[PDB]
Amino acid sequence: PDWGYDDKNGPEQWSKLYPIANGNNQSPVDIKTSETKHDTSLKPISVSYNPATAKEIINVGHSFHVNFEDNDNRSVLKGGPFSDSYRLFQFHFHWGSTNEHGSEHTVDGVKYSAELHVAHWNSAKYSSLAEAASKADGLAVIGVLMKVGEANPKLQKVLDALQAIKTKGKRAPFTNFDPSTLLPSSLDFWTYPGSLTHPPLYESVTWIICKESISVSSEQLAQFRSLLSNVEGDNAVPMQHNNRPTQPLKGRTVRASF
Ligand SMILES: CC(=O)Nc1nnc(S(N)(=O)=O)s1
Ligand SMILES: [Zn+2]
C-alpha cells in the first residue's frame, strides 16, 4: 500500500495512488455551527456493547487498533439516523505532533487536540466487514473530540496496554472492555455522509460527531506519540502524527440532533 503521513507519502500525495482522494464525499470536514440543520427525524443514539467482545490491541504502524469479535450482534449501535443496527468492530485514535492541534474534524474552524473513532459495520445488509467497507451505507463511525486539560482516568487501561505493542505488527490480548465508558455524558451529535480518513478512502461512512468533548492530558498524548512505526530490531521512528487535513464539503449538509 505504502502511504503515510510524512511529506513523501502524506495526505497531499494520496491522490496520486488513490483517485477517490479527490472525491465529493471525503472526510474529515469543518463543521460550521451556523450552517448546520436541525433534523427532527434524528433519534437518540443508543450503544449496547458487551465487554466480552473485546479481543486484541495491535500496532499497525501508522496507529494502533483495539479489535472486537464481530461474529454476533452482542455489541451494536442503533438510533441516530439509522434504521438498522451496526456491529462494533474497532476503536482507534488520531493525534498530531503538538498537543494542541491533532483532531481530524474541526468545529467553527477550531482544531482540537485529538479524536477517538469508534467504528461499526452494517451487519443487517452485508456479510462481512470486507464487503460492507466500500458500500455507501457500509460503515458508521462515532467521532469524539478530545481537548487537552485534565488527565482522563478512563483512558488508563488503553495506555497500560501500549507497552506490549511497541513496534509494528505486535499484538496483545485486550479483553473485558466496554468502550462506551469513553463517550461523553450527553450524546447530542452532528451527522454527515463522508469517508474513511485514510487509504483506501472509501466513501462508505456515516459520521456521528459528538457535540461534547472529553479531556486528556498532555502526558497521555505523549504516550501515543511514543509508539514506534518500525518493526522490532530496526531504528526507532515514532508515530508522530496521523491526522488528515479537512476536505471541502462539496455541498453536503451537516445535520444536528438538537
Ligand atoms: C475498516 C476500516 O474502518 N478502515 C478504516 N480506515 N479509516 C477509518 S476512519 N479513520 O475513518 O475510522 S476506518
Ligand atoms: Zn480514524
Q: What are the extents of the domains in the chain?
A: 1-258
Place of cell 450527553: 186
Q: How far is the CA of 35 from the centre of ligand 2 (A)?
A: 25
Distance of CA 145 to the CA centre of its chain: 10
CB count within 10 Å of CB 153 equals: 8
Among 74, 73, 71, CA closest to 52? 74
**Bridge partners of residue 188, in order along the sequence:** none
Please say whether the beta carbons of 255 and 80 come within 8 A. Answer: no
Calculate the dihedral angle through the C-alpha atoms of 80, 196, 25, 140, rounding to the nearest 10 degrees: -10
Place of cell 466480552: 52
Measured CA to CA in angstroms, residue 137 lies from 82, 123, 194 at distances of: 10, 11, 10
Residue 38 marked ligand-binding: no
Please say whether the beta carbons of 77 and 45 come within 8 A. Answer: yes
Mutate to test the pocket of ligand 1, among 105, 139, 243 (most ligand atoms within 8 A of CB): 139
Place of cell 491526522: 243
The burial class, CB within 10 Å (0-12 / 13-18 / 19+), for 82 is buried
Calculate the dihedral angle through the C-alpha atoms of 87, 90, 96, 99, rounding to the nearest 10 degrees: 90
Among 168, 164, 165, CA closest to 229? 168
Omega cis (within 30) before 179 = no
Mode of pairing for the β-strands spanning 54-59 and 64-68:
antiparallel
- Gaps in the chain (C–N > 2.5 Å) come after which residues? none
Residue 65 marked ligand-binding: yes
Place of cell 455541498: 251
Judge if the beta carbon of residue 141 lies within 6 A of ligand 1. Answer: yes
Give, using CA atoms, the residue closest to atom 11 of ligand 1: 196
| Ion ligand 2, residues whose Cβ is below 5 A away | 117
CB count within 10 Å of CB 215 equals: 16
Cell numbers standing for residue 85: 443496527
SS3 168: coil
Judge if the beta carbon of residue 256 lies within 6 A of ligand 1. Answer: no
Asked how this structure was determined, the answer is X-ray
Place of cell 437518540: 44
Per-state percent for the chain, helix, strand, coil, to nearest 5? 15, 30, 55
Distance of CA 57 to the CA centre of its chain: 15
Identify whether 120 is a catalytic site residue: no
Please say whether the beta carbons of 189 and 210 come within 8 A. Answer: yes
Vertex 140 angle, CA 190 and 32, to 5°: 20
Residue 241 marked ligand-binding: no
Vertex 209 angle, CA 54 and 173, to 5°: 15
CA dist 121 and 141 (Å) reads 9
Q: Quote the strand ranges of 123-253, DSSP E.
A: 139-148, 171-173, 189-194, 205-210, 214-216
Place of cell 511529506: 7
Q: How far is the CA of 196 from the centre of ligand 1 (A)?
A: 5
Q: Which fold has domain 1-258?
A: Carbonic Anhydrase II (3.10.200)
Give, using CA atoms, the residue closest to atom 3 of ligand 1: 119
Give, using CA atoms, the residue closest to atom 13 of ligand 1: 196
Give, using CA atoms, the residue closest to atom 9 of ligand 1: 196
Omega cis (within 30) before 193 = no
Among 133, 126, 129, 250, CA closest to 201? 133
Calculate the dihedral angle through the C-alpha atoms of 87, 199, 197, 221, rounding to the nearest 10 degrees: 90
Phi/psi at 253 (5° precision): -120, 130
Judge if the beta carbon of residue 208 lies within 6 A of ligand 1. Answer: no
The burial class, CB within 10 Å (0-12 / 13-18 / 19+), for 121 is buried
Mode of pairing for the β-strands spanning 86-95 and 106-107:
unpaired
CB count within 10 Å of CB 46 equals: 14
Among 63, 107, 88, 141, CA closest to 213? 107
DSSP 52: G
Among 139, 145, 25, 24, CA closest to 82? 139
Q: How far is the CA of 117 from the centre of ligand 2 (A)?
A: 5
